[PDB]
Amino acid sequence: MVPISPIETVPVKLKPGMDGPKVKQWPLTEEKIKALVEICTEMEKEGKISKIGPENPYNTPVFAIWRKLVDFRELNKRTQDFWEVQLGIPHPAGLKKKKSVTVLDVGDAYFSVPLDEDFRKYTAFTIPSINNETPGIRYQYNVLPQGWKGSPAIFQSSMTKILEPFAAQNPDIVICQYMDDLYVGSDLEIGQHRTKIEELRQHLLRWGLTTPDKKHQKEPPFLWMGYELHPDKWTVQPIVLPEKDSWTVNDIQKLVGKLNWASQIYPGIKVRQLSKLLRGTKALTEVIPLTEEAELELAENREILKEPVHGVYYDPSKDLIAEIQKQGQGQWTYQIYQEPFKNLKTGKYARMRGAHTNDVKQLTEAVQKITTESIVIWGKTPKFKLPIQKETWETWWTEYWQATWIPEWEFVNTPPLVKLWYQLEKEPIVGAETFYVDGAANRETKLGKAGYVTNKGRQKVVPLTNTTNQKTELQAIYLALQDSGLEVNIVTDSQYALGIIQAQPDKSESELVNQIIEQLIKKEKVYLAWVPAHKGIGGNEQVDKLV
């Protein structure tokens, strides 16, 4: 017998202060008992488990469904934390095209790796005897159990350690490692490739790891994790959108998830109108109707999901390009490609939850997202094609109070173009009328007044019902904008209004703010000055709106 190489065990401990699991074994039928006896007998013969004495005080429940099922949940609660690296999965758009590609699934993955002997006594379980008239048959694991917390991490590290020298000795191939699977790829001739695969599974066999001996059980196209991997292209598995005249919150969540999944290769997917209905969640049972916006959006989604679209694979020798389009209502869509009309992948971005916003900020955020995603998938930042003029971005970042930056990018003229809708003056305007504005409200009656006095003698005060100080302060400015010429100086003591306007929004959740914006857009020059309130500053008439 050729001595199979030994796999060094991983030292495992329990969580501090805890002890091994001790759970009462469930009563099983005579049939189930016989089945488990046969199975565990065979396993014991194979060396996966071993009989133990009555000394072992720990026990884990076992069931039969024949296939056995050891419920390690309590042990999983008592087992230490392990380093999971499985967070994130390989994205098809990141894969570099190879002439030949092989998939190997290891058989008896966990049962091929030895368990730390000092930990084996915590994996003990008992098979109930017939009529329970004899002491139940006692067993413990000698290898990694299916369903245990530490099994994936240990198996993964073991596989990595085993694979390292082969990979080092074969730089002309690439090996991707994912759970119980290995994915090898090379640009070699098919014969050399099959040869190297045979060498690989031989090398794995040296450590006692079994691979498909026949023609490998999986050949292209590969269906994996919702993806379809083809020799020259990739896509997603076909979409399934349920149709019912009565939608629940859970169905909304599933639909949203599926649309999101479809959006990574299908361009133009929108999910806003359907996501707005997820307000007041945690109630999975409900009947929520659909608006015309939502219905048209979903119909348009079916329209896009009508015909199949494929993404290509990554080529490191060509540049990486990301192009962005504005879709409206805080929605953005983007394509990542290298050759025209051949997307590596697609995606979308939705604006955050805010009271005020503008297009430039949203485009910026979208750029950050695409940048991070691209660094994950391809390990580099793509060159950007943005629907914004160079001079627009220039003016923005040069005059913006916050620091901001966009990586290398160029202007692409595909409307609607992101633009700056208004620009406040930095100095007072000569020859322009000066509106001193003010507003005030009563906290109890919610009655207020908003208005202005100007240097030409123009005056106005409007009485308001159901309002606040902030609302009247905005309203005054709005009045001044309404009644002034194309150029106007405005004086306010409202740090609130000044804050809002200095944040530079182009759209708002407040109708009043939006109207103010609409006024600002129509203006040629606006200078907005601030003064302290109640400081006896003439012009600033707090007493005119407090009557």
Partner 1 sequence: IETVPVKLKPGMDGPKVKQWPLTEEKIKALVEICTEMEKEGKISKIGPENPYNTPVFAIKKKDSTKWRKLVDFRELNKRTQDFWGIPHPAGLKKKKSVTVLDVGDAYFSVPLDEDFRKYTAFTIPSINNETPGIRYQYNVLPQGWKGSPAIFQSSMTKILEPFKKQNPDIVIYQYMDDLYVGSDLEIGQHRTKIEELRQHLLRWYELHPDKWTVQPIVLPEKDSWTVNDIQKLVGKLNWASQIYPGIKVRQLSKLLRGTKALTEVIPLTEEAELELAENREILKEPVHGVYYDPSKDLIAEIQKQGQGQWTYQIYQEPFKNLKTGKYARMRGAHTNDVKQLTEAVQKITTESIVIWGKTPKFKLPIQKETWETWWTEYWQATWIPEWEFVNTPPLVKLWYQ
Ligand X SMILES: Cc1c(Oc2ccccc2OCCn2ccc(=O)[nH]c2=O)cc(Cl)c2ccc(C#N)cc12
Which positions make up the binding site for Mg(2+)? 105, 180-181, 438, 473, 493, 544
Q: Report CA dihedral (40, 44, 47, 50) to the nearest 10 degrees.
A: 100
Token code pair at residue 110: 């966990």
Residue 85 interacts with which of partner 1, ligand X, none, CB < 5 to 8 Å by class:
partner 1
CB 152 within 8 A of CB 62: no
CA angle 64, 68, 69 (to 5 degrees): 90
**Binding of ligand X by 194 (CB under 6 A):** no
Q: Is 85 among the residues that bind ligand X (CB under 6 A)?
A: no
Distances in Å between the Cα of 242 and the Cα atoms of 239, 247, 302, 304 are 10, 10, 11, 16
Q: Does 224 bind ligand X (CB under 6 A)?
A: yes
Q: Which of 25, 56, 146, 157 binds partner 1 (CB under 8 A)?
A: 157
The count of residues interacting with ligand X (CB under 6 A) is 19
- Is 176 among the residues that bind ligand X (CB under 6 A)? yes
Binding segment (CB under 6 A) for ligand X, from list 222-230, 257-265, 468-476, 526-534: 222-230
Which of 416/428 has CB closer to partner 1?
428
Whether the upstream peptide bond of residue 416 has omega within 30° of 0, thus cis, is yes
Q: Are strands 447-454 and 459-465 parallel, antiparallel or unpaired?
A: antiparallel
Q: How far apart are CA 346 and CA 510, in angstroms?
A: 33
Q: Which is nearer to ligand X, 185 or 387 (CB)?
A: 185
Which of residues 129, 260, 381, 469 is near partner 1 by CB under 8 A? 381
| CB of 90 or CB of 268, closer to ligand X | 90
> Residue 130 or 176: which CB sits closer to ligand X?
176
Q: Which neighbouring-strand residues pair with 181?
A: 105, 178
96-104, 245-253, 255-263, 354-362 -> range binding ligand X (CB under 6 A): 96-104
User: Does residue 532 interact with partner 1 by CB under 8 A?
Assistant: yes
Q: Are strands 447-454 and 433-441 parallel, antiparallel or unpaired?
A: antiparallel
Backbone angles phi, psi at 166, to 5 degrees: -65, -45
Indicate whether 154 belongs to the interface with partner 1 (CB under 8 A): yes
- Residue 134: burial class (beta carbons within 10 Å; 0-12, 13-18, 19+): exposed
**CB nearer to ligand X: pick between 170 and 392:** 170
Quick one: 101 or 143, whose CB is closer to ligand X?
Answer: 101
Angstrom distance (rounded) from CA 128 to CA 513: 74
Using DSSP, state whether 439 is helix, strand or coil: strand
CB of 191 to partner 1, least distance (A): 25
β-strands 525-530, 487-492: how paired? parallel
- Reading the block at residue 412, the tokens are 């692409």
Binding mask 425-444 for partner 1 (x = CB under 8 A): --xxxx--xx-x--------
Q: Which residues contact 317 (CB under 8 A, 6 or more apart)?
A: none
Nearer to partner 1, 220 or 499 (CB): 499
Q: How far is the CB of 378 from ligand X (least distance, A)?
A: 13
Give the one entry of ligand X, partner 1, none that residue 502 binds, where binding means its C-beta sits below a cut-off of 5 to 8 angstroms depending on kind.
partner 1
Positions that interact with ligand X (CB under 6 A): 90, 95-98, 101, 103, 174, 176, 183-185, 218, 220, 222, 224, 229, 231, 313
